[PDB]
């Protein structure tokens, strides 16, 4: 059964903010881990989470005209032994 989210995309974009969206996997997700950062940049990526009930997220404070790499991971319960697992990622790029 799928744990990787699918079809990640930007669905709204201003010069400094993006709304990303994806299709949840079939497993119940505890929360999503989302990173974004300048592609090939030499600073650390930004990181945040959204609740596992969601399948979108708002990214704010971007610099106009910068290519960003945006990645989403699902963190989810499997069984009592594997109680907290990270899915494979899905990633997109977007230039503001």
């Amino acid at each position: 059964v799928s744990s990787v989210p699918t079809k990640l995309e930007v669905v709204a974009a201003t010069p400094t903010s993006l709304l990303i969206s994806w299709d949840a996997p079939a497993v119940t997700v505890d929360y999503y881990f989302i990173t974004y950062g300048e592609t090939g940049g030499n600073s650390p990526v930004q990181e945040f989470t959204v609740p596992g009930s969601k399948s979108t997220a708002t990214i704010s404070g971007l610099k106009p005209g910068v290519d960003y790499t945006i990645t989403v991971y699902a963190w989810y319960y499997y069984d009592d032994e594997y109680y907290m697992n990270e899915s494979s990622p899905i990633s997109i790029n977007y230039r503001t």
Partner: protein, 109 residues
Amino acid sequence: QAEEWYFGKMGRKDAERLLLNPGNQRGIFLVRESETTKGAYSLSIRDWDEVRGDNVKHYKIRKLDNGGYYITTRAQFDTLQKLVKHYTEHADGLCHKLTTVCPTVKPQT
């Protein structure tokens, strides 16, 4: 290793009860032996959420056949100390970055 964050043999619910003490902020943590996978560890972290309030999350630290330790296979570490340092620098998927070790009651002085 017998480091400050290492609590040795400790059960999941007992780790939760200790971390959920009033006064512990998010990111307070401990490392213990796993009771469900032999040879693995568990990183137990005090967290907070809008719906469930104060809570505790557990992350299994597994061992690589030849390599070191990992919670997620993309981030691997030669030692537990290096793992803890990494997740003190950035949460990198954890519910919260690690701050300081869970306190315990000490003898009166």
